[PDB]
Structure formats: structure tokens, C-alpha cells
Design an enzyme around this catalytic site. Structure first.
Site, PDB file in Angstrom:
ATOM      1  N   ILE A  87       1.197  -1.091   0.033  1.00  0.00           N
ATOM      2  CA  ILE A  87      -0.081  -0.091   0.104  1.00  0.00           C
ATOM      3  C   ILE A  87       0.978   1.262   0.027  1.00  0.00           C
ATOM      4  O   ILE A  87       1.569   1.555   1.004  1.00  0.00           O
ATOM      5  CB  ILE A  87      -0.957  -0.132   1.010  1.00  0.00           C
ATOM      6  CG1 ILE A  87      -2.100  -1.035   0.998  1.00  0.00           C
ATOM      7  CG2 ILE A  87      -1.626   1.424   1.663  1.00  0.00           C
ATOM      8  CD1 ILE A  87      -2.751  -1.682   2.180  1.00  0.00           C
ATOM      9  N   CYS A  88       0.957   1.950  -1.329  1.00  0.00           N
ATOM     10  CA  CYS A  88       1.097   3.269  -1.146  1.00  0.00           C
ATOM     11  C   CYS A  88       0.054   4.055  -0.483  1.00  0.00           C
ATOM     12  O   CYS A  88      -1.017   4.073  -0.771  1.00  0.00           O
ATOM     13  CB  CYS A  88       1.336   4.148  -2.610  1.00  0.00           C
ATOM     14  SG  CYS A  88       3.146   3.835  -3.063  1.00  0.00           S
ATOM     15  N   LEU A  89       0.057   4.660   0.898  1.00  0.00           N
ATOM     16  CA  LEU A  89      -0.613   5.544   1.471  1.00  0.00           C
ATOM     17  C   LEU A  89       0.528   6.489   2.292  1.00  0.00           C
ATOM     18  O   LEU A  89       1.566   5.970   2.628  1.00  0.00           O
ATOM     19  CB  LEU A  89      -1.267   4.660   2.652  1.00  0.00           C
ATOM     20  CG  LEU A  89      -2.593   5.572   3.333  1.00  0.00           C
ATOM     21  CD1 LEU A  89      -3.513   5.929   2.239  1.00  0.00           C
ATOM     22  CD2 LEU A  89      -2.966   4.860   4.364  1.00  0.00           C
TER      23      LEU A  89
END
Length: 152
Positions: A87-89
Site C-alpha cells: 500500500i502506497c498511503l
């Protein structure tokens, strides 16, 4: 030996278990505790609404001091989400703070499906098919959500 990391996660666990969110859950592994296993459904109105997705939260001993990384154990298709099941967050990079809790971590990832973050096209293919072949996108999401039901 008593480890402060281990103690923190077991407290966090107890808090989550007395105060649980809806449409997401998360618990530890059976024997390991640096590695948690967690679950999300699509919220209402999403193409994901029936389908359930499975995650792992990856912790450190310097926790919550470092961002808890997340992996996708199950196949996932989203423009914020690698084929590598990560996850890119932005809050899970430099913008983290030791304020977010296990509910907060997961409820973000739920709403991220309803509202992707176009500021970071992690896998340019997914963002490409959004602008290009939205009807293929719709196919893949039915197929990926369908894969949830592989046990019945």
C-alpha cells in the site's frame, strides 16, 4: 525477556478487541506477533461491496514509532496498491505519526477503495485502465471480488 514492543501490540490488540470498527477487522498471527492478519470489505456503493480482501500488518520493535507497513496477502487491483501486495498511503511513509490506531489503519484502507488517491499513481497500469478502459476495470473488479468466494 519482556519486550516493550510485544507489550504495546498486545495492549493495542486489547483496545481494538474492546472497541472494534465495522467493515474491517484485524488480529495477530497465531504464534508470531510482528505480523498481524487483517480483513476489509468494500463499503456500500463500491464495486467491492460483497468481496472481502485479506491483509497482513507488518510491525517493528520500534513501534508505533515507525509506520506499520501493510501487505496484501490476497491479489489486489487498485492504483494505490502494488502487484507486490503493498500500500502506497502517504501516512504510511514520512507523514506517519504515533496517533493512528489499528482501527484507523484499516478504516483508511477501506475508504481508499471508495476514493483512490490520484496524487500517487503507484502502478501506472491501474491508473491507465481507469482513464482508458474503465469497462475492463469494472470486469477485473467483479473478477477479483469473485475470487473472494473461492471457498464456499
Amino acid at each position: 525477556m519482556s519486550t516493550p514492543a510485544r507489550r504495546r501490540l498486545m495492549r493495542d490488540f486489547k483496545r481494538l478487541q474492546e472497541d472494534p470498527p465495522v467493515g474491517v477487522s484485524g488480529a495477530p498471527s497465531e504464534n508470531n506477533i510482528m505480523q498481524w492478519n487483517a480483513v476489509i470489505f468494500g463499503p456500500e456503493g463500491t464495486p467491492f461491496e460483497d468481496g472481502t480482501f485479506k491483509l497482513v500488518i507488518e510491525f517493528s520493535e520500534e513501534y508505533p514509532n515507525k509506520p506499520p507497513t501493510v501487505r496484501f496477502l490476497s491479489k489486489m487491483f487498485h492504483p494505490n496498491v502494488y502487484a507486490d501486495g503493498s500500500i502506497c498511503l502517504d501516512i504510511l511513509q514520512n507523514r506517519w505519526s504515533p496517533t493512528y490506531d489499528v482501527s484507523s489503519i484499516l478504516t483508511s484502507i477501506q475508504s481508499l477503495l471508495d476514493e483512490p488517491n490520484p496524487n500517487s499513481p503507484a502502478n501506472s497500469q491501474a491508473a491507465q485502465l481507469y482513464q482508458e478502459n474503465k469497462r475492463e476495470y469494472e470486469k477485473r473488479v467483479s473478477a477479483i471480488v469473485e475470487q473472494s468466494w473461492n471457498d464456499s
